Design a protein around this ligand. Structure first.
Ligand code: PT5
Ligand code: 3PE
Ligand code: CLR
Ligand code: CLR
Ligand code: CLR
Ligand code: CLR
Ligand code: NAG
Ligand code: CA
Length: 1260
């Protein structure tokens, strides 16, 4: 049968896999053992599938005798299927191991060798990320322990009315309160704080054990629902110090970690494109584009002689060619496209009846005129030269589609879908007048050249979603049916619904809600029931990795080729225009101590602006700051006065005078103080912007951002055009259709008047009368300016499922919703998310990365210096031996040898590991015996750690002990726990947090974690001004928010509450941080719209005077600018460390060169520079051949060359470490024949940093 398992028997079993994948998507999970006919026949078909796979297993197991992973997986699936079928026939948890059927789609990857390569390229890019997964795990553990020690059991009480404990009488969302002696949220008028409450999320979200806390910390790290936890803690303990926990956790484990991931992935993509260039693949793309260039060239020249007639087309056809390329037929078509866009983007809801006539006549006249355009271009330029180009085929398709789809809406067969909106994609022809069109054409060329790889990465992305959708359907199918009056929309009941839910989890929005529903579907918070959260954890952290390795590996690997093609076409043009044109052509202003004081006053005038009181119109604090501004602006005027004697202007003194003039005319009017003041006090936020031209480096990192902004002017305009097109298509689908009545039984505005009966919590015995209101969606598709705002919030992955499930229910204009009407309309949102929120955003990030690479890398050195020998010679010049501190008076040497042994390290590491375990099982509700045991167990750990501190201080001496930073870090921990024990046997918690920091010592171990973290921290420190831009942005926007939305009333049912408001600078900064992390920022935006209530203190005109419409611009601009600046800082830090991110550890470098120092250390205690001649035999053989040679005996050619290379100018064993290191590194790489020593001598004084005449002894 070794013959029968070849030929298309492997295609038969592939079609069988495809059939079993369709028989899995048709199955409908029914609650409580229900079924239908289809699910009854599918089980019968499973027998055929299983019998087919079992004979495949037989024929491959008696013909091969398993070693491969895929065949073993197939055997496992077959065995589990047999066992499940037999068990089900026996009983007739039975159907609980059917979840192994979802691993059968994984056989499609193995069935074709063209996708195994892609899967391996995706999976092997992950092993460099295991040095970031460990860091994330350590951060999670440390923060879980800190939350255990800070917020354990504090979220188990809430307002309970005053009749007893009836049922959590505060809406459907009860929040934790605190007792009258507490510092948390106090209960309302007719309520009392009383314990005995499940928890904020049915007891799932809390810090009770190391299982709840370790999952709450992870959920916060994924930046989803972290403000909810922060506000629950705020209501529990207080509003003073949970932000120090949560904001630090977000910064350390969500932004820093993502920066590390981006750096490691970009340095790995570059370290493969460099290999591809070395082998050669750009040449194929380059030598193909010039081919069709001449095939667009000479092949038009052949057709230009087609009508040289020596039957009378020369009169007209010669003019048709001229007119087409006359810059008249190029501007006329642009004007027509602009007109078409104008009449397409003018379709609103309830438009005037004449507009719907003008636009439909235009949609026919312009369509006919464009058809005439096509016909004129085709026959007058060759019918096969109209297919050579890419826009020409696109225009052909769009014209033909417009003509075809016009009829289907003309006579009612089909409902409009905006087919002509794609002529706009011809406005991108206006880029021809700009230089930014050869750059945008090569990107499309690379995208269309790597189509076979894009369509395979997308296929793997879809297979992942399908497999996890089937698994979620198996687990949670027919289980999200709870008795609560709300029917969950994101469920796992169908195949399309499962696909939508898995896609929503992959996008990240509200994944924690689906996880909570899944946890409560399998019971509640309990050991066996809560174990179904690994599904949502693994799905999130293994789908967000695939979404970032599929789309970034397409953006960066294609933009790098696009820029290479652009460079090639830019040098070819220059060479042609240079050689082809070569045969024919041939006073205290300038102080230093005064500018730094003016800068201090500038920075002081911005604190008096952030300390104001937005609400209280008249207050004491508002009086001195209004009084201190008099002296503040006078000095800025005296500085401005003193600068007109010096000279008589630049583009920064304009702003410097603008602020002073604004302040003066603010104090100038002083009489119209109800007007202008609230539109002139907003321009006071330009006060911090006066340090841009006074704090050089801040001037450089503002020039760099403005140079970088003009470079992304292609990615920002193409994305805007795509968003406009998608909005125009969405207005034709959801205009006038997203309206709803409060009474779900009424589907007309003339039918939604009056009051209706509502039942609280679905209790029929408790009716409540509510008014009937006809309302629209929060974000609608009525205009072309509302669709672009509804789509922006979708692209930011905020509240997009709500819009999805509101648009699915829409069926008819001027009508209400219908449950699951057009579930097939979700493809619109899926395509928009894939194209805009996944493809174009990653293109923008990759463009920033590549642009920074070229901007900061093209200089290099231009003088040989290969990219390892550079640092090799640099450290050869700058080096010295280490210090050892051997303890003379051997009474100390015994203890020192004991301490510096390799067993003390393991003993201490095990001690820390046991301490972190003893701190990891302090639960809530522990018995008193457990608490006393915990105390008299921490006692021993503190004792052994203080004796180890003493026994290390004795050996290393107080001079050599505290010198190393690690001992002083442990010194506080031991002291922080010694005093903690004393005050624990008898009120503070900050001393307990010291013990957890001991795990940081274990974290900072290994040569990968330590090196990566240290290099990234150093790169962060090397650019302190790039991070100042974000601080300035946050400060400016916080001040603006304080002056605009600072007076809005604090209702707890809105998004402007006690926790979230603009009433203080810290609160405004926290709100802006929340919006930067993307946490219902659109809800805060809509809670700041005009027509809300002002606030007690901020003074009637109180109909509703608060809210500005400035909110839309404020929030959208802040989101865009914050994202841009965060990406800017991220890429700057990443490419400040690109020599480590592309290290190629298999070749010489700092790693072995630094170890040479330590292997020297013992032989030479002091630095000095004197050597032992006994070294030769063992010197290089001590470590490895990567530095020296492979431990060979001191009689080989390697040993002969060890002495043959003359030690530079040193008698006997007095060679300096620099000389021997340089000789070693020049033997290891870049070897040269004798007589070139003077060449190296002259090279080491030309382009390297100054030697300071310190190589005078190292010359020969
Ligand atoms: C705050 C509490 C404590 C924070 C940290 C305390 C630090 C005090 C001790 C500092 C020791 C610093 C010396 C040190 O060891 O620096 C790092 C390790 O440090 C970490 O990873 C340290 C990583 C720290 C991670 C912090 C995350 C923990 C979260 C805290 C939770 C706080 C939450 C608070 C909640 C409050 C609620 C109210 C390693 O130092 P190194 O020995 O590798 O570096 C040397 C040297 O610097 C060379 O320049 C370096 O070359 P490059 O690598 O090319 O730069 C050589 O490095 P390699 O040998 O690796 O090539 C080495 O030859
Ligand atoms: C990505 C890069 C991000 C960079 C920006 C990070 C932003 C971190 C956010 C910092 C502020 C956090 C919010 C905050 O301070 O908490 C609010 C709270 C005020 O609440 P309060 O009215 O005091 O409480 C009433 C009931 N006791 O606070 C207080 O109690 C006052 C604490 C004052 C803190 C001053 C420093 C904050 C501003 C830094 C700029
Ligand atoms: C060429 C592209 C980029 C810009 C097109 C701008 C025009 C066609 C669009 C943009 C903003 C639109 C307006 C946005 C809002 C309103 C208010 C309401 O009464 C519906 C129509 C009306 C008045 C729209 C008419 C069409 C409109 C003016
Ligand atoms: C591979 C990843 C994505 C999924 C892992 C699934 C496995 C390891 C987990 C996740 C869900 C878990 C189930 C969750 C809840 C229950 C209900 C109860 O009767 C105990 C066992 C049982 C049935 C668990 C068994 C183990 C389980 C099936
Ligand atoms: C480098 C600079 C720009 C960073 C920002 C520092 C300034 C603007 C911030 C940092 C901390 C802030 C203070 C934090 C807390 C309070 C208490 C509050 O009841 C009034 C405002 C006041 C007094 C803030 C004034 C502005 C402040 C001093
Ligand atoms: C860091 C390593 C040791 C992981 C720690 C896991 C162990 C030690 C922790 C995590 C989950 C914990 C359990 C979670 C919930 C409860 C219910 C509570 O009413 C009694 C304690 C008990 C039963 C906890 C005991 C300790 C526990 C088993
Ligand atoms: C929220 O604000 C106040 C606070 O009570 C009140 O008007 C009402 O509860 C809410 N506002 C509206 C308009 O419903
Ligand atoms: Ca969200």
């Amino acid at each position: 049968i070794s013959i029968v398992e070849w030929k298309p028997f492997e295609i038969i079993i592939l079609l069988t896999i495809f059939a079993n994948c369709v028989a899995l998507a048709i199955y409908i999970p029914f609650p409580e053992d229900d079924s239908n006919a289809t699910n009854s026949n599918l089980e019968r078909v499973e027998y055929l599938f299983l019998i087919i796979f079992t004979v495949e297993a037989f024929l491959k197991v008696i013909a091969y005798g398993l070693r491969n992973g895929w065949n073993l997986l197939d055997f496992i699936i077959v065995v589990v299927g047999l066992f499940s079928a037999i068990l089900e026939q026996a009983t007739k948890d039975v159907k609980a191991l059917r979840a192994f059927r979802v691993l059968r789609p994984l056989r499609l990857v193995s069935g074709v060798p063209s996708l195994q390569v892609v899967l391996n390229s995706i999976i092997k890019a992950m092993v460099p990320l295991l040095h970031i997964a460990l860091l994330v795990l350590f951060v999670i553990i440390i923060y879980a322990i800190i939350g255990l020690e800070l917020f354990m059991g504090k979220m188990h009480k809430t307002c309970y009315n005053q009749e007893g404990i009836a049922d959590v009488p505060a809406e459907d969302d009860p929040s934790p309160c605190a007792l009258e002696t507490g510092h948390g949220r106090q209960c309302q008028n007719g309520t009392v704080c009383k314990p005995g409450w499940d928890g904020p999320k049915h007891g799932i979200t809390n810090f009770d054990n190391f299982a709840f806390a370790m999952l709450t910390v992870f959920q916060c790290i994924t930046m989803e629902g972290w403000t909810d936890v922060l506000y629950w803690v705020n209501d529990a303990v207080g509003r003073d110090w949970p932000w120090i926990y949560f904001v630090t956790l977000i910064i350390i484990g969500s932004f820093f970690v993502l920066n590390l991931v981006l750096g490691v992935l970009s340095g790995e993509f570059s370290k493969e494109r460099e290999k591809a260039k070395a082998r050669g693949d750009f040449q194929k793309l380059r030598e193909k584009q010039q081919l069709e260039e001449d095939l667009k060239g000479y092949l038009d020249w052949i057709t230009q002689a087609e009508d040289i007639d020596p039957r009378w087309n020369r009169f007209c056809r010669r003019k048709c060619r001229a007119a087409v390329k006359s810059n008249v037929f190029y501007w006329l078509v642009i004007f027509l496209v602009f007109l078409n866009t104008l009449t397409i983007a003018s379709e609103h809801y309830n438009q005037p009846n004449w507009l719907t006539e003008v636009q439909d006549t235009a949609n026919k006249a312009l369509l006919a005129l464009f058809t005439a355009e096509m016909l004129l271009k085709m026959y007058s330029l060759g019918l096969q030269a109209y297919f050579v180009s890419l826009f020409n085929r696109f225009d052909c398709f769009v014209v033909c589609g417009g003509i075809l789809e016009t009829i289907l809406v003309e006579t009612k067969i089909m409902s409009p879908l905006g087919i002509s909106v794609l002529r706009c994609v011809r406005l991108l022809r206006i880029f021809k007048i700009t230089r930014y069109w050869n750059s945008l054409s090569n990107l499309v060329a690379s995208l269309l050249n790597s189509v076979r790889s894009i369509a395979s990465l997308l296929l793997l992305l879809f297979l992942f979603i399908i497999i996890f959708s089937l698994l979620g359907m198996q687990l949670f199918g027919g289980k999200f049916n709870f008795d609560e009056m709300q029917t969950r929309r994101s469920t796992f009941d169908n195949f399309p619904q499962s696909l939508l839910t898995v896609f929503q989890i992959l996008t990240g929005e509200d994944w924690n809600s689906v996880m909570y529903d899944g946890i409560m579907a399998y019971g509640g918070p309990s050991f066996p029931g809560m174990l179904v959260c690994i599904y949502f954890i693994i799905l999130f952290i293994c789908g967000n990795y695939i979404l970032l390795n599929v789309f970034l590996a397409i953006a960066v690997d294609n933009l790098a080729d696009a820029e290479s093609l652009t460079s090639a076409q830019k040098e070819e043009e220059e060479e042609k225009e240079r050689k082809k044109l070569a045969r024919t052509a041939s006073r205290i202003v300038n102080d230093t101590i005064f500018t730094n004081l003016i800068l201090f006053f500038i920075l002081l005038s911005s604190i008096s602006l952030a300390a104001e009181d937005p609400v209280q119109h008249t207050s004491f604090r508002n009086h001195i700051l209004g009084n201190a501004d008099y002296v503040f602006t006078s000095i800025f005027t005296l500085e401005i006065i003193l600068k007109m004697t010096a000279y008589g202007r630049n583009y920064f003194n304009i702003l410097d005078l603008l602020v002073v003039s604004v302040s003066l005319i603010s104090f100038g009017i002083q009489s119209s103080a109800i007007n202008v003041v609230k539109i002139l006090r907003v321009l006071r936020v330009l006060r911090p912007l006066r340090a841009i031209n006074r704090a050089k480096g801040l001037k450089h990192v503002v020039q760099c951002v403005f140079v970088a902004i003009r470079t992304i002017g292609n990615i920002v305009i193409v994305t805007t055009l795509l968003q406009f097109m998608f909005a125009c298509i969405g207005v034709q689908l959801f205009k006038g259709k997203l309206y709803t009545c409060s009474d779900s039984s009424k589907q007309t505005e003339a039918e939604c008047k009056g009051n209706y009966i509502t039942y609280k919590d679905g209790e029929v015995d408790h009716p409540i009368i509510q008014p009937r209101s006809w309302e629209n969606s929060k974000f609608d598709f009525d205009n072309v300016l509302a669709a672009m705002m509804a789509l922006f919030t979708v692209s930011t992955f905020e509240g997009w499922p709500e819009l999805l499930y509101r648009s699915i229910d829409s069926h008819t204009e001027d009508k209400g919703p219908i449950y699951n009407y057009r579930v097939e309309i979700s493809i619109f949102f899926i395509i928009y998310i894939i194209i805009i929120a996944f493809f174009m955003m990653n293109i923008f990030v990759g463009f920033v990365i590549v642009t920074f690479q070229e901007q900061g890398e093209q200089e290099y050195k231009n003088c040989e210096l290969d990219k390892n020998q550079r640092q090799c010679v640099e450290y050869a010049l700058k080096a010295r031996p280490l210090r050892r501190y051997i303890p003379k008076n051997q009474h100390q040497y015994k203890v020192w040898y004991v301490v510096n042994s390799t067993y003390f390290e393991y003993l201490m590491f095990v001690l820390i590991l046991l301490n972190t375990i003893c701190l990891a099982m302090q639960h809530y509700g522990q018995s008193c015996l457990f608490k006393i045991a915990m105390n008299i167990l921490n006692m021993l750990f503190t004792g052994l750690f203080t004796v180890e501190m003493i026994l290390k201080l004795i050996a290393f001496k107080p001079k050599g002990y505290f010198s190393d930073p690690w001992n002083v870090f442990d010194f506080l921990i031991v002291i922080g726990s010694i005093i903690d024990v004393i005050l624990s046997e008898t009120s503070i918690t900050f001393f307990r947090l010291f013990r957890v920091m001991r795990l940081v010592k274990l974290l900072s171990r290994g040569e990968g974690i330590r090196t990566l973290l240290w290099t990234f921290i150093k790169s962060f420190q090397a650019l302190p001004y790039v991070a100042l831009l974000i601080v300035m942005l946050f400060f400016i926007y916080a001040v603006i928010g304080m002056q605009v939305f600072g007076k809005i009333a604090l209702n707890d049912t809105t998004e402007i509450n006690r926790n979230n408001n603009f009433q203080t600078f810290p609160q405004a900064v926290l709100l802006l941080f929340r919006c930067a992390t993307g946490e219902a920022w659109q809800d805060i935006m809509l809670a700041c719209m005009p027509g809300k209530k002002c606030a007690p203190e901020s003074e009637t005109e109180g109909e509703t005077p608060c809210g500005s419409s400035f909110a839309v611009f404020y929030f959208i601009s802040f989101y865009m600018l914050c994202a841009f600046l965060i990406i800017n800082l991220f890429v700057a830090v990443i490419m400040d460390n690109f020599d480590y991110l592309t290290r190629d550890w298999s070749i010489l470098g700092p790693h072995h060169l630094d170890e040479f120092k330590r292997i020297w250390a013992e032989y030479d205690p002091e630095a000095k520079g004197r050597i032992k001649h006994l070294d030769v035999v063992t010197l290089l053989r001590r470590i490895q051949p990567p530095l020296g040679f492979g431990k060979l005996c001191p009689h080989r050619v390697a040993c002969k060359r060890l002495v043959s290379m003359n030690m530079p100018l040193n008698s006997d064993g007095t060679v300096m470490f620099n000389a021997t290191l340089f000789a070693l590194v020049r033997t290891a790489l870049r070897i040269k024949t004798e007589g070139n020593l003077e060449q190296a001598n002259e090279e080491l004084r030309a382009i390297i940093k100054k030697i300071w005449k310190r190589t005078s002894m190292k010359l020969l």
